[PDB]
Each structure stands twice: as structure tokens, then as C-alpha cells.
Design an enzyme around this catalytic site. Structure first.
Site, short mmCIF file in Angstrom:
data_model
loop_
_atom_site.label_atom_id
_atom_site.label_comp_id
_atom_site.label_asym_id
_atom_site.label_seq_id
_atom_site.Cartn_x
_atom_site.Cartn_y
_atom_site.Cartn_z
N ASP A 6 -6.53 -21.25 80.40
CA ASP A 6 -6.97 -20.73 79.10
C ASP A 6 -7.55 -21.84 78.24
OD1 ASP A 6 -7.54 -18.62 77.25
OD2 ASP A 6 -5.49 -18.56 76.54
N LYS A 58 -10.11 -23.47 75.94
CA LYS A 58 -11.08 -23.02 74.96
C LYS A 58 -10.81 -23.82 73.69
CE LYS A 58 -8.11 -19.05 73.74
NZ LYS A 58 -8.10 -17.58 73.30
N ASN A 110 -7.49 -23.60 71.80
CA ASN A 110 -6.31 -24.18 72.46
C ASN A 110 -6.37 -25.70 72.58
OD1 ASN A 110 -4.95 -21.78 72.68
ND2 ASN A 110 -5.67 -21.36 74.77
N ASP A 168 -0.91 -24.35 74.41
CA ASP A 168 -0.87 -22.98 74.87
C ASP A 168 -0.98 -22.85 76.37
OD1 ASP A 168 0.09 -21.99 72.44
OD2 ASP A 168 -1.47 -20.48 72.22
N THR A 197 -9.35 -15.60 78.27
CA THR A 197 -10.18 -15.14 77.17
C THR A 197 -11.59 -14.83 77.67
OG1 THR A 197 -8.91 -16.67 75.79
CG2 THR A 197 -11.04 -15.92 74.95
C1 7CP Z 1 -4.37 -19.22 71.50
N1 7CP Z 1 -4.49 -19.17 70.03
C2 7CP Z 1 -4.53 -20.55 69.51
C3 7CP Z 1 -3.16 -21.21 69.58
C4 7CP Z 1 -2.05 -20.38 68.92
C5 7CP Z 1 -2.05 -18.99 69.56
C6 7CP Z 1 -3.43 -18.35 69.40
N2 7CP Z 1 -2.40 -20.23 67.50
C7 7CP Z 1 -2.05 -21.13 66.52
O1 7CP Z 1 -2.43 -20.92 65.37
C8 7CP Z 1 -1.33 -22.27 66.90
C9 7CP Z 1 -0.69 -22.25 68.13
C10 7CP Z 1 -0.07 -23.46 68.26
C11 7CP Z 1 0.68 -23.89 69.32
C12 7CP Z 1 1.20 -25.15 69.25
C13 7CP Z 1 0.99 -25.94 68.13
CL1 7CP Z 1 1.73 -27.49 68.32
C14 7CP Z 1 0.25 -25.49 67.01
CL2 7CP Z 1 -0.05 -26.46 65.60
C15 7CP Z 1 -0.33 -24.21 67.13
N3 7CP Z 1 -1.06 -23.45 66.32
C16 7CP Z 1 -1.57 -23.86 65.02
C17 7CP Z 1 -0.74 -21.10 69.12
C18 7CP Z 1 0.35 -20.17 68.86
N4 7CP Z 1 1.19 -19.40 68.71
#
Ligand code: 7CP
Length: 268
Positions: free
Chosen positions: A132, A134, A137, A154, A165
Site C-alpha cells: 500500500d 502511496k 502512507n 500503515d 488503493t
Molecule cells: C492510509 N491513510 C493514511 C494513514 C492513516 C490511515 C489513512 N491516516 C492518518 O491520518 C495517520 C495514520 C498514521 C499512522 C501512523 C502515524 Cl505514526 C501517524 Cl502520524 C498517522 N497518521 C497521521 C494512519 C492511520 N490510522
């Protein structure tokens, strides 16, 4: 309970079955990201994340030690959620960085790609496919510098090689063919195209049209975006966006590629 040891703060992000909150470890003051993953109520429930997805993710993160991959600090679990205490990365997603910048110079793109490719090389050396990759991530440590550091995140569909995705899936995913490390290489090609152009190469008006474009390898280096792009950059992308996974550049080959090396090789 997790909240005994970690004081939860602001919500940093969310998806269908996960929420991520900033938190503070009460014993040390160190800040982390707490990812709350909603469990299935029953083993094969439609809603929630499979317990298999959770354990597989946890086990992969615990085995990885690399500067460009997020670390897992601890795990808590109650009846409804598994909470991963992850390294906090505060500079936002590469997705948002790119949004503000619109498109990157080849130097800026290769500075990111060297880090992404290093992390992926580490995974692939262990026969782990991320599946995944992108810009959403890929997280930045600090967004207000010329050469920001990144971490991959992720790992919820990562697998050891013994559907992600739509815009980023390889043809073998679209066509239900055998999967391997090569899918990640395709996704790197997609990322690279996006970094240089601000456009997603296979995107259609509908998901079905996007997937059809992927399977046909229907993309071009439209002069709208690529009028100034080097033939090296195009060679890099073209050798990744190949339908037959056996013909696609491997991670080692991508790191050896002259485009990636160009910035290291030159003085000015
Ligand atoms: C795949 N997407 C992006 C990552 C996802 C899930 C949705 N979204 C987030 O906003 C996010 C994710 C994070 C995962 C790990 C860390 Cl260390 C951080 Cl600061 C993350 N953030 C900010 C993901 C979740 N849930």
C-alpha cells in the site's frame, strides 16, 4: 488500560476502522501516535479489522529496524480495540506536502525517493511487500526544510512473500494474478510520476476506468507536465510501470539507477 499510561490528546487522522491520536507517555513525557484499530466483534464479522490483519501488522513492525520506517513502541488491547503506540511523526503526509508544492523538481523528488527506496530495500531484503505504498502512507518528520526526512507507515496489508488503493495497484492486483515484491515497485513508479507532475498517471473519472487504465498500462508523459523532464527520469518511471512483473526493475536495480544517483554524482 492504555490511558493509564498514555494521556491521549488530539486526533491526528482517521480511516474507516482506525483513529490515530497524539499521546504522551506519562512516565517519560515522550510523545507518540496511538493508533486505535477497531476489532471485529466476531471472527469473520464484516465490520472491523481482522485480527489477522492486526497481528500480521504488529509482527512486521516489531521485526523492522530502519530509519525510514515507523517504529512500534507498545501495544494495548481491550475488548473493542487494539491500540498501537507508534513513533510520532509530526510533519504530515507526503500527500499534503505535495499538495502545497504542486509538483517537485527532479532533485526534490529524488531526495524523497532515495529514502523511500531505502526503506523498501530493507523490507524487500526480508521478503516483505508493503502492498500500500502511496503518498498518504509516507510521513514527514519536518515539513519546513529543503530535504525532509520520511517514514513509511500503515503496514496493515503488508505480507511476507514466501487489494490496496485503486490509483496505486499494479496490474497483477487488478487481474488477480500472483503477487510478489514487484507490486511495490509498480507503486513506486506511480509515486514518482505524481511527484514530478502533480497528476496521477492512471486516474480516470471512475474507479473502474482507473483500474482499466492500470491493466492496459494506459499512461503517457503528457507535455502539460513533462515538457522539461529529463530522459533519465522518464527511463526510471518507464522501467517501473511495466505490466509483466518479471520485467519490472527490482528494488536493487532502482537504487542503482542513474536518475537516483544523478544528484549524488554531480557537484552543481
Ligand atoms: C492510509 N491513510 C493514511 C494513514 C492513516 C490511515 C489513512 N491516516 C492518518 O491520518 C495517520 C495514520 C498514521 C499512522 C501512523 C502515524 Cl505514526 C501517524 Cl502520524 C498517522 N497518521 C497521521 C494512519 C492511520 N490510522
Amino acid at each position: 488500560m492504555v490511558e493509564d499510561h498514555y494521556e491521549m490528546g488530539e486526533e491526528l487522522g482517521s480511516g474507516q476502522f482506525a483513529i490515530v491520536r497524539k499521546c504522551r507517555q506519562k512516565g517519560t513525557g515522550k510523545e507518540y501516535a496511538a493508533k486505535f484499530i477497531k476489532k471485529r466483534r466476531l471472527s469473520s464479522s464484516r465490520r472491523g479489522v481482522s485480527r489477522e490483519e492486526i497481528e500480521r501488522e504488529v509482527n512486521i513492525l516489531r521485526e523492522i529496524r530502519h530509519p525510514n520506517i515507523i517504529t512500534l513502541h507498545d501495544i494495548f488491547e481491550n475488548k473493542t480495540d487494539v491500540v498501537l503506540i507508534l513513533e510520532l511523526v509530526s510533519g504530515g503526509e507526503l500527500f499534503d506536502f505535495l499538495a502545497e508544492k504542486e509538483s517537485l523538481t527532479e532533485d526534490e523528488a529524488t531526495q524523497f525517493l532515495k529514502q523511500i527506496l531505502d526503506g523498501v530495500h530493507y523490507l524487500h531484503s526480508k521478503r516483505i511487500a508493503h502492498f500500500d505504498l502511496k503518498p498518504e502512507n509516507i510521513m514527514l518528520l519536518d515539513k519546513n526544510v529543503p530535504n525532509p526526512r520520511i517514514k513509511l507507515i500503515d503496514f496493515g496489508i503488508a505480507h511476507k512473500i514466501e487489494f490496496g488503493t485503486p490509483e496505486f495497484v499494479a496490474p497483477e492486483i487488478v487481474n488477480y494474478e500472483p503477487l510478489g515484491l514487484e507490486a511495490d515497485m509498480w507503486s513506486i513508479g506511480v509515486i514518482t510520476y505524481i511527484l514530478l507532475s502533480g497528476a496521477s498517471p492512471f486516474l480516470g473519472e471512475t474507479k473502474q476506468e482507473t483500474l482499466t487504465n492500470i491493466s492496459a498500462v494506459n499512461y503517457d508523459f503528457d507535455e502539460e507536465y513533462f515538457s522539461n523532464t529529463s530522459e533519465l527520469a522518464k527511463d526510471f518511471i518507464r522501467r517501473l510501470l511495466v505490466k509483466d512483473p518479471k520485467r519490472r526493475m527490482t528494488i536493487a536495480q532502482s537504487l542503482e539507477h542513474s536518475w537516483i544517483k544523478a544528484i549524488r554524482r554531480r557537484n552543481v
